């Protein structure tokens, strides 16, 4: 299920407005790894997975991001997020045709809700960013455009 999951979870982290505004060209390193850390842990949980899946795919997105430059911006992090996703969840068993844009969308609304309640303590200003309207319109993207 890798490329539907990666057309899925990508363009919503893409489309939204959170994300653009917490993984921002420059970050901290480990501002990023930080928030990194708590959003997929709050969105692997919502999925109900095992800790050694979510070992993995820290470990996995950990490796991901590493790879993104400082002088990257938003959008190669949206990326990084996805690589590791795909990677851990794309052929185990947890994805499959069935639910891969359900899985996509409760794993963008956890990235975006579990980012969202971490950054402004990490220093990130999210003043008029409405996060409700963030995840619906990427939800609404991913179950119907």
Same mark, same amino acid.
């Given at each position: 299920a890798t490329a539907k999951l990666l057309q899925a979870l990508v363009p919503a982290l893409l489309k939204s407005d959170v994300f653009r505004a917490i993984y921002k060209? #420059?970050?901290r390193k480990q501002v990023v790894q930080y928030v990194t850390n708590s959003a997929l842990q709050q969105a692997a949980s919502s999925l109900g997975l095992d800790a050694s899946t979510i070992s993995q795919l820290q470990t996995k997105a950990t490796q991901a991001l590493s790879?993104?430059?400082?002088?990257?911006?938003s959008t190669a992090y949206a990326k990084a997020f996805g690589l590791a996703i795909a990677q851990v969840?794309?052929?185990? #068993?947890?994805?499959?045709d069935a639910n891969v844009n359900q899985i996509g969308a409760k794993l963008a609304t956890g990235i975006l809700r579990g980012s969202s309640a971490v950054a402004p303590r990490l220093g990130i200003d999210l003043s008029g960013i409405n996060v409700d309207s963030d995840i619906g319109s990427v939800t609404s993207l991913i179950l119907s455009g």
């Open positions: 060209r #420059g970050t790879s993104v430059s400082a002088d990257s911006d969840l794309g052929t185990s #068993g947890q994805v499959n």
